[PDB]
Every structure is written in structure tokens, then in C-alpha cells.
Write a protein that binds this ligand. Sequence first.
Ligand code: HEC
Ligand code: HEC
Ligand code: HEC
Ligand code: DXC
Length: 71
Amino acid sequence: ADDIVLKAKNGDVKFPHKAHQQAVPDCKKCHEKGPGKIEGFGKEMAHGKGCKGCHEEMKKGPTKCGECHKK
Ligand code: HEC
Ligand code: HEC
Ligand code: HEC
Ligand SMILES: C[C@H](CCC(=O)O)[C@H]1CC[C@H]2[C@@H]3CC[C@@H]4C[C@H](O)CC[C@]4(C)[C@H]3C[C@H](O)[C@]12C
């Protein structure tokens, strides 16, 4: 399957899966989550534990606006 881009108005956000599969061997951080997680994602989650928050906790991955968002 392919990577996906989240179409944030301020600039596309790429989500590269391979880097995540390699750096986050605890797959249950994202997979086998209960129902509602597809509907639930948005800016709040993304800037929280959905994206940015995990990068901060694990001490790796982009945490600056222009590192995630790029036109
Ligand atoms: C969130 C940060 C994730 C972590 C950690 C892991 N995966 Fe993942 N996976 C995630 C998304 C958003 C998607 C779909 C979008 C995409 O970029 O592919 C996936 C997809 C998979 C797939 C399908 C991949 C393919 O067919 O090319 C598999 C098999 C998969 N995920 C498994 C997997 C495993 C085993 C992980 C731990 C080592 C793992 N993922 C981490 C989100 C996230
Ligand atoms: C943990 C549960 C994570 C979640 C949820 C998300 N990311 Fe992540 N990401 C995580 C780690 C530990 C790393 C470092 C990987 C490395 O080897 O550098 C990353 C990395 C990225 C990257 C850069 C990948 C690279 O090749 O350097 C990007 C662009 C990125 N992450 C984006 C991203 C987005 C958009 C997420 C939410 C949709 C997201 N990540 C979630 C850990 C975790
Ligand atoms: C990755 C770890 C991110 C960082 C660092 C920042 N943002 Fe972000 N943002 C990210 C994603 C994956 C999304 C999309 C959420 C979704 O619905 O899929 C967003 C969203 C925004 C938005 C809203 C865009 C829209 O609703 O169309 C804005 C205005 C925004 N982001 C701005 C922004 C700024 C200023 C940041 C630095 C302070 C920043 N983001 C960090 C992922 C990530
Ligand atoms: C559920 C995990 C981990 C965050 C959490 O604990 O809530 C998060 C991390 C990244 C999230 C995905 C990012 C890309 C997609 C955004 C869409 O708008 C909704 C479906 C997807 C596929 C999201 C589904 C789910 O919301 C994920 C996999």
C-alpha cells in the first residue's frame, strides 16, 4: 500500500509508513485501536498524541510547523 498525504490547508502533511514501522515497533500505538479512530482524527489529535505528541514523547520525529507541513 501507499503512503498517504493529509491535505492540511496550510500545507500537505506526508505520512511515511516505513519510517514508522521501523521506529515504532510497538504497532499497537496505532493499530488495533478501537472503533472511532478514523472518524476521530483531526488537527487536535495531529498536534497532540496523533502525531506531534508522539514525536515529543519518543524524542524523535518532526515537531516544527514546516517539518510536517510543506506545500
Ligand atoms: C502510526 C504511527 C503507525 C504505526 C506506529 C505503525 N503503523 Fe502501520 N499503518 C499506519 C497507517 C496510517 C497505515 C495506512 C497508511 C500508510 O501509510 O500505509 C498503515 C499501514 C500498515 C500496513 C499496510 C502497509 C502496506 O500494505 O504497504 C501494514 C501491514 C501495517 N501498517 C503494519 C504495521 C506494523 C506491523 C507496525 C509495527 C511495526 C506498524 N504498522 C506501525 C500507521 C501506523
Ligand atoms: C508514535 C506513536 C508516532 C506517531 C503516532 C506518529 N509518529 Fe511520526 N515518527 C515517530 C518516530 C519515533 C519517528 C522517527 C523515525 C525516524 O527514523 O526518524 C517519526 C518520524 C516521522 C517523520 C519523518 C520520517 C523520516 O524519514 O525522517 C514524519 C514526516 C512523521 N513522523 C510524520 C508523522 C505524522 C504526520 C503523524 C500523524 C499522522 C505521525 N508521524 C505520527 C513516531 C510517531
Ligand atoms: C506533525 C508532527 C505536525 C506538526 C509539527 C504541526 N502540524 Fe499542523 N497538522 C498536522 C496534521 C497531520 C494536520 C491535519 C489534521 C487532519 O485533519 O488530517 C494538521 C493540521 C493543521 C492545521 C489545520 C489545517 C486544516 O484544517 O486544513 C493548521 C492550521 C496547522 N496544522 C498548522 C500548524 C502550525 C502553525 C504548526 C506549528 C506551530 C503545526 N501545524 C505543526 C501535523 C503537524
Ligand atoms: C490511532 C492512531 C494513534 C493516535 C491515537 O492514539 O489516537 C492514529 C495515528 C495516525 C492516525 C492516522 C493518520 C492518517 C489518517 C487520517 C484520517 O483523518 C483518519 C484515518 C488515518 C489513517 C488515521 C487513523 C488513526 O487516527 C491514526 C493511525
